[PDB]
Design a protein around this ligand. Structure first.
Ligand SMILES: *[C@@H]1O[C@H](CO)[C@@H](O[C@@H]2O[C@H](CO)[C@@H](O[C@@H]3O[C@H](CO)[C@@H](O)[C@H](O)[C@@H]3O)[C@H](O)[C@H]2NC(C)=O)[C@H](O)[C@H]1NC(C)=O
Lengths: 26, 50
């Protein structure tokens, strides 16, 4: 039923100090 | 035995804020010094028996 109506492009960038999470509930 | 965490000690009500997504507390030496009661949400201190 779906159709290919997006086909988004891709790029590159620099990820600064991000993506840090709590490893445990301590 | 607080939700699986077993140990021996004396409980004591503390004034710490525990980031309610957290359950246990540890010191520098990785010793469990503060555990949250899973039923009333208050935080209790863990001190070894004298
Ligand atoms: C797990 O179940 C227990 C049992 O119901 C929950 O404890 C209950 O918590 C409510 C909310 O604080 C208490 O109501 C409050 O009672 C005080 C004293 O009567 C009153 O001054 C407040 O206005 C409010 O009505 C309720 O008394 C308390 N029940 C018992 C038996 O301690 C507990 O909250 C539940 N766990 C979680 C995570 O919700």
């Amino acid at each position: 039923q779906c159709v290919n109506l997006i086909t988004r492009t891709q790029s590159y960038t620099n990820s600064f100090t991000r993506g840090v999470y709590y490893p445990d509930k301590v | 035995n607080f939700n699986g965490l077993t140990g021996t000690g004396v409980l004591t009500e503390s004034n710490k804020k525990f980031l309610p997504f957290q359950q246990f507390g540890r010191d520098i030496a990785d010793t469990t010094d503060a555990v949250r009661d899973p039923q009333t949400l208050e935080i209790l201190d863990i001190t070894p028996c004298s």
